Amino acid sequence: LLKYNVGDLVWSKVSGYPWWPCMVSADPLLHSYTKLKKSARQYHVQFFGDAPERAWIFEKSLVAFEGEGQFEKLCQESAKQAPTKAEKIKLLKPISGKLRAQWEMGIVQAEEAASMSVEERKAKFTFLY
Amino acid sequence: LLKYNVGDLVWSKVSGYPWWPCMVSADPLLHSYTKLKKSARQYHVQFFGDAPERAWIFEKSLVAFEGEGQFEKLCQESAKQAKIKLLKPISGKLRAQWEMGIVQAEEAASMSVEERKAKFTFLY
Ligand SMILES: *[Se]c1ccccc1C(=O)Nc1ccc(N)cc1
Ligand SMILES: *[Se]c1ccccc1C(=O)Nc1ccc(N)cc1
């Protein structure tokens, strides 16, 4: 009903990006982890990878994390839901360069976090402000 | 035609936050600083203050940064555009971050765009 909770591992769909492996956390500054922007709701996540990035992301753009094997399937539904064939084709981009390297880092870290207890991976990966 | 460029100080309005001082910058991973989310244009900023946060923000949610003084004014016209939700005290660790990032923003407004691109951009 509240689909996610702090510590839940999620994929984030961010514009301009492939699906990115994440963890739900509380905002260091706001102290919440979900809010109403006034009734399609956000969750605050951390992005995995050696970049310590964080964001508030819409429920509509999160998907609970099951493993790297989800990935290909996730991108199809992103395409299954695009209007024209100018948005459904806009996803055929190769993940290369620094972006792939960060992404791989993120995916490896997410599986590292997936095999953990929630209260474990909470205390190991949550950024300390 | 493009309302900002790499090195421009702007205020950004992120929901649930008070207006934040930022610099327009190139996304290190995407290698762009502006894009169409497709007819709502975004720019990529980095939020001043010691936590190096960066985001794509909408053009509708950015104002150019002349100095701390506009804060009041900016907020009042935001609250007139919903409403009572922005009537909260900026306190604690958020006020500390905010005040820190404002300070860095005023400092970069004296420099040339070259000066501030060197000093203030993030090494990624
Ligand atoms: Se979602 C996906 C599946 C297969 C191949 C590529 C993608 C993808 O999102 N690629 C991509 C590459 C680069 C950038 N900047 C965004 C997206
Ligand atoms: Se924008 C503003 C002007 C005057 C006083 C306060 C504000 C403000 O936004 N405060 C605020 C406090 C806490 C949070 N989470 C958001 C905003």
Pairing of strands B53-58, B62-64: unpaired
> From the CA atom positions of chain A, what is the Rg in Å?
15
HSE-up of residue A121 (Cα within 13 Å, Cβ side): 20
HSE-up of residue A38 (Cα within 13 Å, Cβ side): 6
Neighbouring residues of B5: CB distance < 8 A, sequence distance ≥ 6: B24, B33, B113
Whole-angstrom Cα distance, residue A2 to residue B1? Answer: 43
Which residues in chain B touch residue A17, judged by CB atoms under 8 angstroms apart?
A: 29-30
DSSP B121: S
Residue nearest to atom 17 of ligand 2 (CA): B18
Neighbouring residues of A116: CB distance < 8 A, sequence distance ≥ 6: A124
How many CB atoms are located within 10 Å of the residue B76 CB?
11
Q: What is the least distance, in Å, from the CA of B112 to any CA of chain A?
A: 28
User: Is B8:B29 a contact under the CB 8 Å cutoff?
Assistant: no
Neighbouring residues of A97: CB distance < 8 A, sequence distance ≥ 6: B29
Residue-range definition of the domain harbouring residue B60: 1-124
Q: Among residues A26, A35, A28, A55, which one has the least CA distance to residue B93?
A: A28
Residue owning tokens 């203050």: B49
What is the count of structural domains for chain B?
1
Experimental technique of record: X-ray
Helices (H) and strands (E) in chain B, counts: 3, 6
> From the CA atom positions of chain B, what is the Rg in Å?
14
User: Is A64:A10 a contact under the CB 8 Å cutoff?
Assistant: yes
HSE-up of residue A104 (Cα within 13 Å, Cβ side): 7
Which residues in chain A touch residue B55, judged by CB atoms under 8 angstroms apart?
A: 55
Tokens of A104: 């791989």
Atom of ligand 1 nearest to the CA of A72: 3
Angstrom distances, CA of residue A51 to CA of A7, B65, B90, B122, B123? 18, 27, 28, 11, 11
Which residues in chain A touch residue B97, judged by CB atoms under 8 angstroms apart?
A: 29
3-state secondary structure of A106: helix
Residue owning tokens 């070259």: B114
Whole-angstrom Cα distance, residue B58 to residue B81? Answer: 16
Q: What is the least distance, in Å, from the CA of B14 to any CA of chain A?
A: 9
- Hey, which residues 2-61 in chain A have their CB within 8 Å of chain B? 14-17, 28-30, 32, 35, 37, 42, 51, 53-56
Strand ranges (DSSP E) for chain A?
9-12, 20-24, 34-36, 41-47, 54-58, 62-64
Tokens of A92: 């055929």
